[PDB]
Symmetry: C3
């Protein structure tokens, strides 16, 4: 009506240990997420990796925490969970799975995942007697 602009991905640092999310190119699907702490993930184990940022997602999307391709193919790393709700205001955590035979070293400042703004519907739910 009166105002004409573009929605932004907003973030705030929760400590000095966080790194501002970055995008490699203009058409990259996601923003890089960086670990704020050191982690040693043993073989066949999981860790909750803290970024020490909180985000406010633009309306009409959720934030999907998605795997970095290189880490999957080379080190058998996968990302668990990964659904960041539009109204989530806490510390953004990344659930890393280490399926490899060797321990996996995460250092503060390492890129460990990517954040994609996935467009979704928020539909109302209706029970019917039967479907067709």
């Amino acid at each position: 009506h009166h105002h004409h602009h573009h929605m932004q991905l907003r973030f705030a640092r929760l400590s000095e240990h966080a790194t501002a999310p970055t995008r490699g190119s203009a058409r990259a699907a996601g923003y890089d997420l960086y670990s704020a702490y050191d982690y040693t993930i043993p073989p066949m184990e999981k860790a909750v990796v803290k970024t020490d940022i909180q985000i406010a997602l633009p309306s009409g999307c959720y934030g999907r925490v998605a795997p970095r391709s290189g880490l999957a193919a080379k080190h058998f790393i996968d990302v668990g969970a990964g659904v960041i709700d539009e109204d989530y205001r806490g510390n953004v955590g990344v659930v890393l799975f280490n399926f490899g035979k060797e321990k996996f070293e995460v250092k503060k400042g390492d890129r460990i995942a990517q954040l994609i703004c996935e467009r979704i519907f928020y539909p109302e739910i209706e029970e019917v007697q039967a479907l067709d």
Copy 2:
């Protein structure tokens, strides 16, 4: 059309719920009891059929708590717009203990992911 329609396929089903107006997914409930051993999989029936809104697919996604605490992951998870079968959740247990699912437990979430349905064209080479 525009809403998420569902029907129960037995009295053991639970209507999906959403915690927030801005929550990405509807929670899905197990209709049955399963014991999933370490390093094993199970298909968990919800006993509901769904009709997704036009222009999306239904992604069965992990609940965050179950992933972080219990090493539970969700396999498969692509529900097509035209799928009218019983909604089954493929759960992977990568934990070292057996994981218990009982009737009425929340085991996954359902997200309405907006997608394109593009036509496909073959070209000699791409730049």
Copy 3:
């Protein structure tokens, strides 16, 4: 009608054109161009020998096939294909099963979904309610 076209090119004789199982199917089926043996608790990069050009306003998600997951404990790793990716489409397959998994040339290994996304600019604030 917008440029709602998925374009592809074959990089070798071994590639199969992606197919859709139904009109309202979420993804196009991706086929292996080669033979692979994936040992238990191991991964493999499975090449399709195709390059793709996604429509504007989406990325390509390489997503798992339901049957392979439920029956054989197969999963898909990585799987984010950027709009501007013009390389060979590789599928990272995880075999979490206790037996070896055989991928043959021409087997359906994954599906490609055009997930609609937004490309917001990033803004740092001191507090989330800053004006």
